[PDB]
Amino acid sequence: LNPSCKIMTFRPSMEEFREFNKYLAYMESKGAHRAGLAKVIPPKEWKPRQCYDDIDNLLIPAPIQQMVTGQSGLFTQYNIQKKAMTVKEFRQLANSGKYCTPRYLDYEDLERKYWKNLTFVAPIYGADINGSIYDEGVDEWNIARLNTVLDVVEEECGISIEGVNTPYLYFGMWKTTFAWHTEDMDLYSINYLHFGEPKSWYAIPPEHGKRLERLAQGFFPSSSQGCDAFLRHKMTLISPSVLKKYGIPFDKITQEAGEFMITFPYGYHAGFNHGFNCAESTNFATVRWIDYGKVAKLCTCRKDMVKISMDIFVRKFQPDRYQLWKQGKDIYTIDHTK
Ligand SMILES: CCc1c(C)nc2c(C#N)c[nH]n2c1=O
Ligand SMILES: [Cl-]
Ligand SMILES: [Cl-]
Ligand SMILES: [Cl-]
Ligand SMILES: [Cl-]
Ligand code: NI
Ligand SMILES: [Zn+2]
């Protein structure tokens, strides 16, 4: 039941690893979702790509320079768009003295340096690049074709998933940040770190996610006035020192190359890259997600934010609740421990 809500790490055998959907069910049966985030280390024999050398030639169309402002563990970011550059050029930039990882003793030391140096040199990243870099034919844990409930309603029912169930690439360098957020529509996500330096993650248990929202609303009241769901803008940073000071439960873990991270519905997460790296990610859903999607607090202020109609999911997977839901009478409190 994982009542401590701590981030679990799973080490499946190849036999266990072959079927992603069965293994995810197993992870939740052990309470992994209560932490908001879990790590899966594949068996050492498994490789999604035999050789990454040709990824050097991949063009990053719109590299982003991350501009962070603030102090005392509380920051907002904005983005400056740079001219396109290849992965090779990006790697050379990341490894240059201006941008490279500092010397550090251990991951805790590096974390301290991250939070102390956020407002000096602005790092650069590539994100939301369409595509997968798995080899063709890889049938296990293939982020481009996970066969979850999102794919069912798209293929069988003709429902638009708004591109959320397709793969994206992220190229990181030292100090590049992903700000606090849940996924679009409070979906799951899966993240594979193909190569390079690690990625550190913070996660808040879903059963405490409202506490993070209230804390952020108190510290960013202008942001909050402008959008009920302003954390979805992915521009808000809050250090673990601030979380500790206000008693918000959280956990932290570092993802190494070759490891998966799964985020769970309404699992707030944030983090940073240690150095040059490449990750691939997508969103997905299970039936347990549907009650989260029905209640997800959506971005008020900008018109093109991702919105998936929940009607098909209730109709097909919650038939006994469908008419009550459309009546506006399907009122409930989610039990995150279930
Ligand atoms: C800094 C690039 C980047 C972004 C924007 N988002 C994430 C992410 C999530 N969620 C996990 N890594 N990651 C990134 O590296
Ligand atoms: Cl240094
Ligand atoms: Cl630094
Ligand atoms: Cl929010
Ligand atoms: Cl994603
Ligand atoms: Ni995310
Ligand atoms: Zn908004």
The domains of the chain, with CATH numbers, are: 7-338 (2.60.120.650)
CA–CA dist 249, 244 (Å, integer): 8
What are the distances in angstroms from CA 307 to CA 161, 164, 210, 283?
Answer: 9, 10, 21, 13
DSSP letter, residue 122: P
80: number of Cβ within 10 Å: 11
Q: Is 208 among the annotated ligand-binding positions? A: no
CA–CA dist 269, 181 (Å, integer): 6
**Active site includes 132?**
no
Q: Indicate which residue of 132, 189, 239, 281 is catalytic.
A: 281
List residues, by chain if needed, whose CB lies under 5 Å from ion ligand 4: 229, 231
Kindly give the residue spans of alpha helices, DSSP state H, lying in 129-181.
Answer: 149-157
- Asked if 164 contacts 308 with a C-beta cutoff of 8 angstroms, the reply is yes
CA–CA dist 62, 86 (Å, integer): 10
Q: Is 33 among the annotated ligand-binding positions? A: no
169: number of Cβ within 10 Å: 21
DSSP letter, residue 299: P
What are the distances in angstroms from CA 68 to CA 19, 74, 99, 167, 179?
Answer: 41, 10, 15, 27, 11
Q: Which helix (H) or strand (E) holds 337?
A: none
CA–CA dist 328, 330 (Å, integer): 6
- Asked if 201 contacts 271 with a C-beta cutoff of 8 angstroms, the reply is yes
- Rounded (10°) CA dihedral 54, 55, 57, 58: 140
Q: Is 6 exposed, middle or buried (0-12, 13-18, 19+ CB in 10 A)?
A: middle
Q: Is 336 among the annotated ligand-binding positions? A: no
CA–CA dist 193, 199 (Å, integer): 8
CA–CA dist 333, 102 (Å, integer): 46
Centre of ligand 4 from the C-alpha of residue 272, in Å: 20
Write the residue with the smallest CA distance to atom 13 of ligand 1.
178
CA–CA dist 107, 284 (Å, integer): 30
Residues with a CB atom less than 6 Å from ligand 1? 125, 127, 170, 172, 176-178, 191, 199, 273, 279
Centre of ligand 2 from the C-alpha of residue 200, in Å: 19
Write the residue with the smallest CA distance to atom 5 of ligand 1.
178
Centre of ligand 6 from the C-alpha of residue 263, in Å: 7
**Active site includes 194?**
no
Q: Which helix (H) or strand (E) holds 218?
A: helix 209-219
Centre of ligand 3 from the C-alpha of residue 117, in Å: 5
Residue type, 208: H
Six-digit token string for 251: 């956990």
User: Solving technique for this entry?
Assistant: X-ray
